Design a protein around this ligand. Structure first.
Ligand code: CL
Length: 194
């Protein structure tokens, strides 16, 4: 049932995630090829890589009203607690929003199945990192993504008419992990797997 072709992707997207909300981030002096936002929600200092749009977005010093979606990863910076992107502005109000998920899957035998879920949204502003990670994990667990088949796309359709796309044959690009969208404006999610 489990094609070893998809081993790396299935491994990555079954990693545990952590969520730190209403926190502060501290950015110190640059000391390598990239900068980090430090978050300290427990006895650890989490080093959050500033990639893509985040590098210009957050200057040296203190940033308040930060939420981070964390997936701890191994890294080349010799850091114990490291994660990439996933930084968003904390809520300014309760958010209780639901977006329908429609899943079309075609296996190696050409069998076409359809499935549905509901993606619960509790955040005003949500990172692509979080949408991409939670949705793939769910598809692995419920729809056998990266089992029999491991290609296709997730598409997040915005109420404002726009859309964002995640190709399932590759890990989400690290620069896009820092991209953020308006959670309240997600309309529906379309997933096609083959
Ligand atoms: Cl640092």
């Amino acid at each position: 049932e489990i094609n070893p072709k998809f081993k790396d992707l299935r491994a990555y997207y079954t990693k545990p995630s952590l969520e730190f909300k209403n926190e502060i981030g501290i950015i110190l002096k640059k000391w390598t090829t990239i900068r980090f936002m430090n978050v300290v929600p427990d006895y650890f200092i989490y080093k959050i890589a500033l990639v893509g749009k985040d590098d210009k977005k957050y200057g040296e010093g203190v940033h308040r009203n930060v939420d981070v979606f964390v997936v701890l990863e191994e890294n080349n910076y010799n850091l114990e607690k490291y994660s990439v992107g996933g930084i968003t502005k904390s809520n300014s109000k309760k958010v209780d929003h639901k977006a329908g998920v429609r899943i079309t899957k075609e296996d190696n035998k050409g069998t076409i199945s359809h499935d549905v879920s509901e993606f619960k949204i509790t955040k005003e502003q949500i990172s692509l990192k979080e949408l991409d990670f939670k949705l793939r994990k769910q598809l692995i667990e419920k729809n056998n993504l990266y089992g029999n088949v491991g290609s296709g796309k997730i598409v997040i359709k915005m109420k404002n008419g726009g859309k964002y796309t995640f190709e399932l044959h590759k890990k989400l690009q690290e620069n896009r992990m820092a991209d953020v969208i308006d959670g309240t404006n997600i309309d529906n999610i379309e997933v096609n797997i083959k």
